[PDB]
């Protein structure tokens, strides 16, 4: 038998190692409330409150800011606008899988498209695991992969750190 | 029914979330040679050649610098002297599991003990995954956990990136 | 009398503290050659070779890549295209002052305009100082100002560390 | 004839470029009160309240936590005990110069000695400048000098950002 843990389900075009950039971040925290974490990740109106690299949001076809399957929305991060659509949403009692495709309105070498996935789950003895991974395609993604320091890595780490702090 | 990936086997005292600091890094790379990666991770004399934060090493009871089960050694990283011993070593055709316990010769609140694990494996379509995770205990671990940027996260990311570059 | 050092001359519009973001980085290095540093900063063809956050460059009306007063150009950084124009260029035997205004082609809340200045000078006993400061205006600059970690600060530090490494 | 700004007075043994690590950080903020900044920097009991990376403080010969010339004290940063002594203190109506030498209780290769200087000053049009620079000697300083992201640079920027936010 194998020693394994739950992993993200990637659509074929976003498989890590098959795109231009891949970033992975993960925290495992004792005493963290699963439901609060889920709530603070899904309801996008909280992001600006705990993750300072993000700003305004807009849900185009909803009267609330809660992400569910197929939610079409936009948000600001690192000062620029990201258009997005939820492509995966499955919430069970001990695990949440949530992922959105993101893109900008640029053309040619400035176009950037991404698939940002999340997996939140309860583990033994009152621990919560938050895994977030992003696969990116386009010329700017090639530049981000070479950046020093790794801006995406630190940015996503700050998202995780803020979500944890805000959920206690 | 579950979607999972191979995961590190933690001894009980080191379980993520039960210690003072947990860091997790991962890369997934297309066309990377699995045997070269294994060679450059196992032979510690290569570390200083591709990972700038590592320094001198010494194997106390071996006439070579190749890590295997129970290897007792020391090395410098981030200017700190780490005493270590390999506590896990399992190498197969498609996967390597390697981990060492590390500690310093300090006492009281200056003491720091860590368990640094690695999982290298071949994935489908000519991809190699390198997962490294570290669990730390002691007062100095509590200070590292608060760093922003996260010092260990960026260090380990650089170790991974160097290991990849060096193995092409 | 005062103890002072040479400082950047700012147009009124860009005065630090009067805009939306201000970034300051500085290195002072022993045994570094002034002329070589100026060459590697002014000749933008070197940027990509030592500063990994920068990509392709283009001079619109020069048959070379040497920045001089009023040089109009564009360069890629953090994956985005920056249009620019040199607004200050004064090179003496022991001090260089160089600055450009930069902007993107975006509209509304995505529009960003910056003034990035540099001061390279010889100091007593074979040391060279490299000071770089940038003032930014626009809604994205307000976001960059609160970013965690500070993206601009770390990127510019990488520019300086690279310039130094490449000039040694 | 020269365009200059006030600069820190370094004792000879700490001159930037002549030691193992030099870090420079600076903010310039509109509407910040000079006296408030001076208060929140000199009264080391506020450090904990606005800068999360600093720990306990202790004053060896004073019944108060206000730093002045020759003030002997110790503090914790990065989970490290640093014995310090103020070696510079000059407070005028529009400029403060404050600096301390710090050291640890270690021998040979683990020994670290630093000189951390500050310059707070009023600038034209209701702006306040806060400049902080640190020069470090010893083997651990050599390691810090190689960190990417630069650990000292990011910690000091956080100190400055906290100081500003708290004094607003």
| Residues whose CB falls within 8 Å of the CB of residue A114, separated by 6 or more in sequence, listed in order | A101, A102, A103, A134, A135, A136, A137, A141
CA distance C39 to C68: 12
A79 to C146: CB separation less than 8 angstroms, yes or no: no
Q: D83 with D112: CB under 8 angstroms? A: no
B29 to A9: CB separation less than 8 angstroms, yes or no: no
A29 touches chain B (CB under 8 A): yes
Q: What residue in D sits closest to C145 (Cα-Cα)?
A: D161
Cis before residue C66, ω within 30 degrees of 0? no
Among B6, B14, B17, most A C-beta atoms within 10 A, so best to mutate, is: B17
Resolution in A: 1.9
Which residues from chain B sit within 8 angstroms of residue D144, using beta carbons?
79
Which residues from chain B sit within 8 angstroms of residue C149, using beta carbons?
148-149
Q: How many residues can be counted in chain B?
A: 168
Q: Name the method of structure determination.
A: X-ray
Among A147, A149, A155, most D C-beta atoms within 10 A, so best to mutate, is: A149
Neighbours of B114 (CB within 10 A): 24
C16 touches chain D (CB under 8 A): yes
Q: B65 with B77: CB under 8 angstroms? A: no
Number of separate domains in chain B: 1
Query: Closest Cα to residue A25, out of A167, A153, A111?
Result: A153
Which residues from chain C sit within 8 angstroms of residue B148, using beta carbons?
148-149
Which residues from chain A sit within 8 angstroms of residue D148, using beta carbons?
148-149
* Domain limits for position B166: 1-168
Q: What residue in A sits closest to D150 (Cα-Cα)?
A: A149
What are the distances in angstroms from CA D83 to CA C9, D87, D103? 39, 13, 5
B79 touches chain C (CB under 8 A): no
Which residues from chain C sit within 8 angstroms of residue A52, using beta carbons?
146-148
Token representation of residue A76: 């600001």
Which residues from chain B sit within 8 angstroms of residue D80, using beta carbons?
143
- Look up the CATH number of the domain holding residue C43: 3.30.530.20
For A154, the closest of B2, B18, B149 (CB atoms) is B149
D154 to B154: CB separation less than 8 angstroms, yes or no: no
Give the distance, in angstroms, between the CA of residue D117 and the centroid of all CA atoms in the same chain.
5
Residue identified by tokens 């970034």 is C23
If you count residue pairs, one on A and one on D, with CB atoms under 8 Å apart, how many are there? Answer: 4
Three-class SS string for B62-125? CCCCECCCCCEEEEEECCEEEEEEEEEEEECCCEEEEEEEEECCCCHHHCCEEEEEEEEEEECC
Query: Closest Cα to residue B69, out of B89, B46, B39, B40?
Result: B89
* Residue D44 DSSP label: T
C123 touches chain D (CB under 8 A): yes
Nearest-Cα distance to chain A for D147, in Å, is 10
| Residues whose CB falls within 8 Å of the CB of residue C121, separated by 6 or more in sequence, listed in order | C6, C34, C94, C95, C96, C128, C129
Task: Count Cβ atoms within 10 A of the Cβ of residue D60 and give its class: 0-12 exposed, 13-18 middle, 19 or more buried.
Answer: exposed
For D149, the closest of C18, C29, C154 (CB atoms) is C154
Q: Look at strands B72-77 and B54-59 and give their pairing.
A: antiparallel
CA distance A15 to A24: 13
Nearest-Cα distance to chain D for A151, in Å, is 10
CA distance D19 to C124: 15
C contact chains, 3+ CB pairs < 8 A: A, B, D
Token representation of residue B164: 């990849």
The string over C34-72, giving b where at least 16 C-beta atoms fall within 10 Å of a residue's C-beta and e elsewhere, is beebbebbbebebbeebbbbbbebebeeeeebebeeebe
Query: Closest Cα to residue A78, out of A7, A158, A24?
Result: A158
Query: Closest Cα to residue D80, out of D59, D63, D99, D105?
Result: D105
CA distance D122 to D104: 34
Chain D window 35-64: which residues touch B at a Cβ cutoff of 8 Å? 52-53
Nearest-Cα distance to chain C for A94, in Å, is 30
D5 to C7: CB separation less than 8 angstroms, yes or no: yes
B contact chains, 3+ CB pairs < 8 A: A, C, D
Q: A34 with A164: CB under 8 angstroms? A: no
Which residues from chain A sit within 8 angstroms of residue C112, using beta carbons?
79
D107 touches chain B (CB under 8 A): no
CA distance B27 to B31: 13
Token representation of residue B94: 């498609």
What are the distances in angstroms from CA B108 to CA B27, B102, B111, B112, B140? 36, 16, 6, 9, 10
A contact chains, 3+ CB pairs < 8 A: B, C, D
Which residues from chain C sit within 8 angstroms of residue D2, using beta carbons?
6
B151 touches chain D (CB under 8 A): yes
Which residues from chain D sit within 8 angstroms of residue C30, using beta carbons?
17-18
């Amino acid at each position: 038998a194998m020693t394994t843990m739950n992993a993200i389900r990637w659509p074929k075009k976003w498989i890590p190692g098959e795109t231009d950039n891949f970033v992975s971040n993960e925290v495992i925290v004792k005493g963290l409330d699963f439901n609060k974490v889920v709530q603070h990740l899904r309801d996008a109106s909280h992001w600006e409150k705990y993750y300072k690299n993000s700003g305004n949001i807009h849900m185009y076809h909803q009267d609330n800011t809660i992400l569910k399957d197929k939610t079409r929305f936009c948000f600001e991060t690192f000062g620029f606008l990201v258009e997005a659509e939820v492509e995966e949403f499955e919430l069970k009692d001990a695990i949440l899988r949530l992922a959105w495709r993101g893109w900008n309105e640029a053309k040619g070498d400035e176009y950037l498209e991404v698939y940002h996935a999340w997996l939140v789950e309860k583990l033994d003895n009152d621990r919560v695991r938050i895994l977030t991974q992003e696969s990116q395609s386009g010329v700017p993604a090639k530049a981000l992969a070479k950046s020093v320091p790794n801006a995406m890595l630190n940015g996503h780490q700050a998202w995780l750190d803020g979500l944890v702090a805000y959920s206690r």
